[PDB]
Amino acid sequence: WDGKIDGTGTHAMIVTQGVSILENDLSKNEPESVRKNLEILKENMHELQLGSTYPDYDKNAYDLYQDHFWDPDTDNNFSKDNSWYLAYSIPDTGESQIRKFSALARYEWQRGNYKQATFYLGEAMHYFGDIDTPYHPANVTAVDSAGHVKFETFAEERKEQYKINTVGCKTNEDFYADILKNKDFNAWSKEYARGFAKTGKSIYYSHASMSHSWDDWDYAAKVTLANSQKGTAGYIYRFLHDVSEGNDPSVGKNVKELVAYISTSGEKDAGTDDYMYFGIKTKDGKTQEWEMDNPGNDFMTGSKDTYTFKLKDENLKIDDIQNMWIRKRKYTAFPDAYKPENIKVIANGKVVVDKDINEWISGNSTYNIK
Ligand SMILES: [Zn+2]
């Protein structure tokens, strides 16, 4: 879906509708804290709207927006168009970004930073909205087909007539109740998103591609836009319950992957081109290290980078990881100083490390973040 940097456009309509829908379907026996948090959420509507359109204008966006894609069947963005990386990486997809930003959103909310929290939730919904288009889950880029942009423009112009005001049931009913059943946010979000993405991919082949009429496009937009609104409303519902009761999805679960969200200082020369590594040390003195290298230029001055690391051992708990750090090693003969501003480490949908740094890492040195 289209979206403008000022927080207007199809993307903004989906989240704005998502809140109204929720308000409409909210059952009377819904907890009081949920009602209050929704009021705080409506108070911050413009940040939800800005976050919903922001990823397309984010200056450190991938050249092709690879991560805005995800095939629910193959489980990747364009087969491996990021340009798949073995032994170190973990390419981001629309699906993983929903999880990343969802974790950031709950974290900020829990500390009363509603402004930042809502912006993050907004970004998470941008990615869900995308996977609910016909083209994104089918992995059909703008380069691959002219119908891609054309379809999103068709939708943008008619967005007003595709708004829905309810999912068709109250929150105490099946659709919403199901959302709350699985405490493992991550396992849930993946399946929930898969269902909508499969419907979008089907719609592409049966109605939204360039082989179809314009009465077909109307039907395709009506269905996928309705589903986008419906699914967003559910995500918001889940969010409100999670932030209101302080539900934690990481509990007891093994840590199979770690996600690092790094903000590089905006100061002159803060970015670097040297080899960067992220490492962990376990209580038992066992260590693992991965090279941080997604890319197209990582660690640019003022950028925000995401890395996902898969752990070797699969029986570890969060408390088992004694230390974590970042280490830099020179590329050429002269070290390239690096100045990170902050680093957050996410495990099982929970921000486990929120570390401000704001200092140079001049040469070949290690810097503990935990
Ligand atoms: Zn979009």
Instruction: State which approach was used to obtain the coordinates.
Output: X-ray
How far is ligand 1, taken at its centre, from the CA of residue 11, in Å? Answer: 6
Closest CA to 201 of 132, 138, 127, 130: 138
Complete DSSP assignment for 257-323: EEEEEEEE--STT----SEEEEEEEETTS-EEEEE---SSS-S-TT-EEEEEEE-S-SS--GGGEEE
Residue with tokens 């995401």: 306
| Helix (H) and strand (E) counts in the chain | 9, 8
Which residues pair with residue 329 across a beta bridge? 275
> Do 225 and 172 share a structural domain?
yes
Cα–chain-centroid distance for residue 282?
A: 28
Please report, in range form, the residues annotated as the binding site for Zn(2+): 1, 11, 56, 68, 126, 130, 136, 148, 152
Neighbours of ion ligand 1 (CB under 5 A): 1, 130
The b/e string for 322-351 (b: 16+ C-beta within 10 A; e otherwise) is eebbbbbeeeeeebbebbbbbbbbbbbbbb
Please report, in range form, the residues annotated as the binding site for Ca(2+): 269, 271-273, 293-294, 296-298, 336-337
Indicate the SS3 state at residue 18: helix
CB distance 48 to 11 below 8 Å:
no
How far is ligand 1, taken at its centre, from the CA of residue 256, in Å? Answer: 30
Q: What gap in Å lies between CA 43 and CA 132, rounded to an integer?
A: 27
* Residue 222, CA atoms < 13 Å, CB-side half-sphere: 8
Indicate the SS3 state at residue 139: coil
> Do 235 and 188 share a structural domain?
yes
Which residues pair with residue 288 across a beta bridge? 280
Domain CATH number, residue 279:
2.60.60.20
Residue where one domain finishes, among candidates 227, 250, 273: 250
> Do 225 and 112 share a structural domain?
yes
CB distance 197 to 137 below 8 Å:
yes
Residues across the chain: 370
Q: What gap in Å lies between CA 263 and CA 305, rounded to an integer?
A: 7
Indicate the SS3 state at residue 91: coil
Which run of H or E residues covers position 147?
A: helix 147-158
Phi, psi of 341 (to 5 degrees): -100, -45
> Do 55 and 154 share a structural domain?
yes
Rg (CA), the chain: 21
Q: Which H, E and C letters describe 309-365, residue by residue?
A: EECCCCCCCHHHEEEEEEEEECCCCCCCCECEEEEEEEECCEEEEEEECCCCECCCC
Angle between the 32-43 and 214-245 helix axes, to the nearest 10 degrees? 120
Q: What gap in Å lies between CA 350 and CA 305, rounded to an integer?
A: 18
State the total domains in the chain: 2
Residue where one domain finishes, among candidates 215, 232, 250: 250
> Do 305 and 166 share a structural domain?
no
Q: What gap in Å lies between CA 264 and CA 104, rounded to an integer?
A: 17
How far is ligand 1, taken at its centre, from the CA of residue 52, in Å? Answer: 9
End-to-end CA distance of the chain: 40
How far is ligand 1, taken at its centre, from the CA of residue 7, in Å? Answer: 12
Which residues lie below 8 Å from residue 241, measured CB to CB, with a gap of 6+?
31, 34, 180, 247
> Do 213 and 122 share a structural domain?
yes
How far is ligand 1, taken at its centre, from the CA of residue 187, in Å? Answer: 24
How far is ligand 1, taken at its centre, from the CA of residue 126, in Å? Answer: 7
Closest CA to 67 of 149, 5, 128, 116: 128
How far is ligand 1, taken at its centre, from the CA of residue 131, in Å? Answer: 8
Q: Which long-range contacts (CB under 8 A, 24 or more apart) does 169-172 make?
A: 169/25, 170/25, 170/26, 170/27, 171/22, 171/25, 171/26, 171/27, 171/30, 171/237, 172/27, 172/29, 172/30
Which residues lie below 8 Å from residue 83, measured CB to CB, with a gap of 6+?
91
Q: What gap in Å lies between CA 187 and CA 99, rounded to an integer?
A: 10
> Do 56 and 42 share a structural domain?
yes
Residue where one domain finishes, among candidates 215, 250, 285: 250
Distances (CA, A) of 226 to 78, 196, 223: 25, 11, 5
The first and second tokens of residue 246, run together, are 């302080």
321-329: strand order across its sheet: 287-291, 275-282, 321-329, 366-368
> Do 15 and 133 share a structural domain?
yes
Domain CATH number, residue 227:
1.10.575.10
> Do 324 and 175 share a structural domain?
no
Phi-psi region of 87 (alpha: psi -120 to 50; beta: other; left: phi over 0): left
Quote the domain boundaries for residue 35. 1-250
Closest CA to 369 of 328, 324, 336, 319: 324
How far is ligand 1, taken at its centre, from the CA of residue 130, in Å? Answer: 5
> Do 272 and 154 share a structural domain?
no
> Do 285 and 222 share a structural domain?
no
CB distance 330 to 338 below 8 Å:
no
> Do 96 and 147 share a structural domain?
yes
Which residues lie below 8 Å from residue 248, measured CB to CB, with a gap of 6+?
350
Beta-strand pair 350-356/304-310: unpaired
